[PDB]
Design a protein around this ligand. Sequence first.
Ligand SMILES: CN1c2c(nc(N)[nH]c2=O)NC[C@@H]1CNc1ccc(C(=O)N[C@@H](CCC(=O)O)C(=O)O)cc1
Ligand SMILES: CN1c2c(nc(N)[nH]c2=O)NC[C@@H]1CNc1ccc(C(=O)N[C@@H](CCC(=O)O)C(=O)O)cc1
Ligand SMILES: CN1c2c(nc(N)[nH]c2=O)NC[C@@H]1CNc1ccc(C(=O)N[C@@H](CCC(=O)O)C(=O)O)cc1
Ligand SMILES: CN1c2c(nc(N)[nH]c2=O)NC[C@@H]1CNc1ccc(C(=O)N[C@@H](CCC(=O)O)C(=O)O)cc1
Lengths: 285, 284, 286, 286
Amino acid sequence: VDSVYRTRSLGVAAEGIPDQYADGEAARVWQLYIGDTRSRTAEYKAWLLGLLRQHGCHRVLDVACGTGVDSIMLVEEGFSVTSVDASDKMLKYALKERWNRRKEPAFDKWVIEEANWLTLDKDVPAGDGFDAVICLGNSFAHLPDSKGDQSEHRLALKNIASMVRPGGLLVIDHRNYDYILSTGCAPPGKNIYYKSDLTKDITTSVLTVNNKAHMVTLDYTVQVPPGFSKFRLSYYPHCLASFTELVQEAFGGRCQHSVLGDFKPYRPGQAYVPCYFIHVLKKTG
Amino acid sequence: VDSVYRTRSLGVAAEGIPDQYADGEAARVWQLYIGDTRSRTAEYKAWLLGLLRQHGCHRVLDVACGTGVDSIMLVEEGFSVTSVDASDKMLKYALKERWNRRKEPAFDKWVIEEANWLTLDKDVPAGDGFDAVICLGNSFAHLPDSKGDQSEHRLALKNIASMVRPGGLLVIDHRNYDYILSTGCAPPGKNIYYKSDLTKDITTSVLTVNNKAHMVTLDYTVQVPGFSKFRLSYYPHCLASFTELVQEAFGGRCQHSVLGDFKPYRPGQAYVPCYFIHVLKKTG
Amino acid sequence: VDSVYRTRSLGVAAEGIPDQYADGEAARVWQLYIGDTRSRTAEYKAWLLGLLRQHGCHRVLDVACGTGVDSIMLVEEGFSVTSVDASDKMLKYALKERWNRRKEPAFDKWVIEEANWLTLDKDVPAGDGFDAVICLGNSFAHLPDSKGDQSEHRLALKNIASMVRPGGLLVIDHRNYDYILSTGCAPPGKNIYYKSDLTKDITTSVLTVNNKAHMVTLDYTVQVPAPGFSKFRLSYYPHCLASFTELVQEAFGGRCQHSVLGDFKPYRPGQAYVPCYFIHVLKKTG
Amino acid sequence: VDSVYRTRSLGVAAEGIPDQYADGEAARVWQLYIGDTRSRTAEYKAWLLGLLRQHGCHRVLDVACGTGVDSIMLVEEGFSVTSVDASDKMLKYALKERWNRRKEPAFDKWVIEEANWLTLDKDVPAGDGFDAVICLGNSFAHLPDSKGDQSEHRLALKNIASMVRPGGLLVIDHRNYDYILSTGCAPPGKNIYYKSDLTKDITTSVLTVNNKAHMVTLDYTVQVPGPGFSKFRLSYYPHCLASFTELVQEAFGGRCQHSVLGDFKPYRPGQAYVPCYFIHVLKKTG
Ligand SMILES: CN1c2c(nc(N)[nH]c2=O)NC[C@@H]1CNc1ccc(C(=O)N[C@@H](CCC(=O)O)C(=O)O)cc1
Ligand SMILES: CN1c2c(nc(N)[nH]c2=O)NC[C@@H]1CNc1ccc(C(=O)N[C@@H](CCC(=O)O)C(=O)O)cc1
Ligand SMILES: CN1c2c(nc(N)[nH]c2=O)NC[C@@H]1CNc1ccc(C(=O)N[C@@H](CCC(=O)O)C(=O)O)cc1
Ligand SMILES: CN1c2c(nc(N)[nH]c2=O)NC[C@@H]1CNc1ccc(C(=O)N[C@@H](CCC(=O)O)C(=O)O)cc1
């Protein structure tokens, strides 16, 4: 009596017709957001290249490839890059760029494949390991805690760590959600990796479940040719002391750990409130 | 009071997490369905190559690329192929095959891009037009009549025909929906193009609105342990209506002939075909 | 990652806020639809009154009460009426009539209660059974074949039949779906029971699953103050005459006399006149 | 290509089938919840009667009638009661109870009707108003702030206040969301009005938007032999004291005397006892 009937199952597609909600207004502005990646900051490039070079890294795994934009810098600079992502919609962009650039030998050797943190050990044979694994741009916080005990967080971080060769590097970040939770507000424009060209106004919604922070949901209203349209994304608010604990546990404690606040050294109680924390772990070996 | 809160907008994605429903039970069985194209029939191949060679075709546009399997055959047999689809999810597979095979010069020159029939003129640069344009496997029927008057069907066909050079070819098919509507059932295993290896149980639902057929919806049950289901829907194009629609896309300025399962179709013939294939030659 | 989250559970309510979708536009036009009962046809009232008095019935159970319009005539005419529906939203209108009219002794004695066909034996005490059980206005057709073997239709009918005393009557109707399946079209304003005052356009959608009729879905479009249009949707199971003749007798184990009427007159198969409704009159000899 | 097909519009019903989601599990457990009122605390009754007898009240409007339980006590105690709710589903049970007791004239005179705080002006004939208007049980908090500016809250209160006769009372409560927001947890079984017989485990979700509390959503889990667990969800606007104090005064344009109670006893700011409910009692200047 109350049942509803779909024309096609959730998740299925067909020749000649766009995929489900592919062409909606939220999707359209979201696409402008993920493309707002044209200006890589000098300090980002200089910091990452410096840290990879300082450790002699050659073989790099990017486990949050997205559109490829972090991985493309490394390809251009002569690293042997493998890049993976669980999201096909985002990988589509990385693959397209690689295809356009395929006559450049460095791009012909760029590996791009579907993989999920939760199955990474299977989806990507480690061999002996990578020299560096990177997970930057606050991508780790895209994974929610839908079971309630952060067991998925721990599995994902363990699998990401298992990709690092002994003596190798993991570099993994999060936005400063300690500040977001204390103020209730996640302001726009602060991406330290790519300088934003897109003008965005953000509403921040924080869900607390029995007094424990559970989700941060950001509603973006983006001015476009004029025009004025909205999309929504959500994030797990990782706080610094928990993530410090988690990321070291993923290695069995067999790691040296340090934390940066926006590319610079971080020490508690410093005047400067970083936008992002960047954890750097050298696995024992 | 009655509102629901989403975690993310319809159609958006994020690094590190699978796209919406992409790992569901439906998507997983559907993937086996779209993958069932390992045994291309000898008749399909020999027919299509013959038609293209008899008309001297070299530049080919595939407007329903999907996983690329129709295109791959033409790429291997020496044609210059451009393949488009509105569906990134299916295009993903064609793109992967091109990349795996990229060291073959033929595959290096295979052009694959996203394009929608409703905006094809804008999405697909046509130069002076293609020698042949193909839309096979009953892909056209994927497009519904949302407006009610079949105006989208007309626009899609106009735009697909606009890709044809004067003197060129369009080859476009549909399943025999005359027969399916008369029986109420669309049985499995009848694909004339690719010999199925997957066993499917199909339930067929036909919706008729004010006595005009409007949608054929198929529920497929396949073994994957584990019977899983997925649903797809189809506009049930009948032969007389489609013949008129396809000629009207050219403005009447075309020669038109109909085949049934690769052979000329003679109305009154005993055999009732599983597919009708329309072969058009544009004036010029 | 794909989860949605509700402000309140499906089905639930709270003081000071309207019930889920209760104030929607579709709901508001549908309320006009179900209120379109100010004009009981004389032919109707004459036929049912005459059929009940012919069989000397006094204790009557209406199993599709609704807003109560059918039961109300009977109440006015001095029957002892028990009226039952599975839908509380509908039952609400009947209750409200009973309350306005409560100082009339007949309305004081009218029983109105919720009950479901599918659990009717438990939901209603029958005693030895009612002299007549009535299910009119094409309400039976409201129950879909969700399982696909019509097991629920047989259960509903079995339970409705068990409410009739021995030598008692079941009067149960259905619109003429043979006709509707043959033209694909359910024409508007044919209600033989209440002449309709509300003008609506209807779109008829028929779903056949594996060549068997499964559902008829009607979209009703009604005019509103550039003046606008608002629609609502209701769906029905398309009972054909042959099948239903089988099902309704089966519900008594074949221990019944059965006749079919077409729009209150005797139906003869092959007759030229094509009825809007078929009413099955069954007398339990059993 | 991505469309769905409903069987029936949102909000609509049909004879012989249950209303939408009416028989779901969440809805079943929730019926036990709103039914958990067999045990009015002796202290509530004494307090409210004392209060109303004190001011000489006779005609009382309950603007959050629900199942009728606040209002039934008042009918029993010889008040002239009009009870309203926007929820037809809760109101069902109040109307059931009046019918059941109609042979007592006090209940024959009890007026029960549907009305919404946001259109209360129209939905109730005010006359020169009521001696007292009660909105108790934390019902007001059921109204969300969907426009973002509390304009619905203001309209709702202003309309409630207009029902009060010159020199009459408004008595309106809210749970202590100051406390719930500080701890993040809504303790179960603290209803000061009716003692819970029913054991529920509560999860409390607080949504904050741009650092402003917007919504508290309670998930209620109850036990069922077979023992397994079943839940339902309700949501509330977290009114803080200082805010609600301002809003309730504004509803009368300040032409009122206001005092606040904490669990039936006078509230003295800074007191060590943290109350479960704040009850605001206002006398209209007139
Ligand atoms: C409809 N929503 C809504 C709105 N704001 C406005 N203006 N209107 C609305 O309708 N925001 C909140 C509300 C819905 N409320 C809620 C409350 C709690 C949870 C909740 O349980 N949320 C978790 C799920 C936990 C999990 O399974 O991991 C969540 O992630 O949101 C969800 C929605
Ligand atoms: C098989 N294609 C083709 C042809 N005709 C010629 N001579 N060559 C071809 O490759 N006719 C049919 C078809 C048309 N294809 C195309 C492909 C690309 C562009 C095009 O892109 N033209 C650009 C330059 C490059 C670019 O846009 O990226 C332009 O600016 O005009 C046009 C027509
Ligand atoms: C979205 N719907 C839609 C429309 N028409 C238009 N113009 N636009 C639309 O989006 N009508 C059909 C379509 C959906 N298609 C279908 C296809 C099959 C079934 C189907 O299975 N229907 C039965 C269910 C069987 C049961 O569970 O008992 C049904 O009752 O509809 C439903 C809808
Ligand atoms: C956590 N407290 C508490 C609760 N219940 C609720 N709802 N709120 C609460 O804060 N239950 C237990 C405890 C009760 N607190 C109190 C606080 C003061 C007085 C009170 O008025 N006490 C006397 C005695 C003072 C003394 O001995 O010093 C007084 O008049 O001060 C009573 C209970």
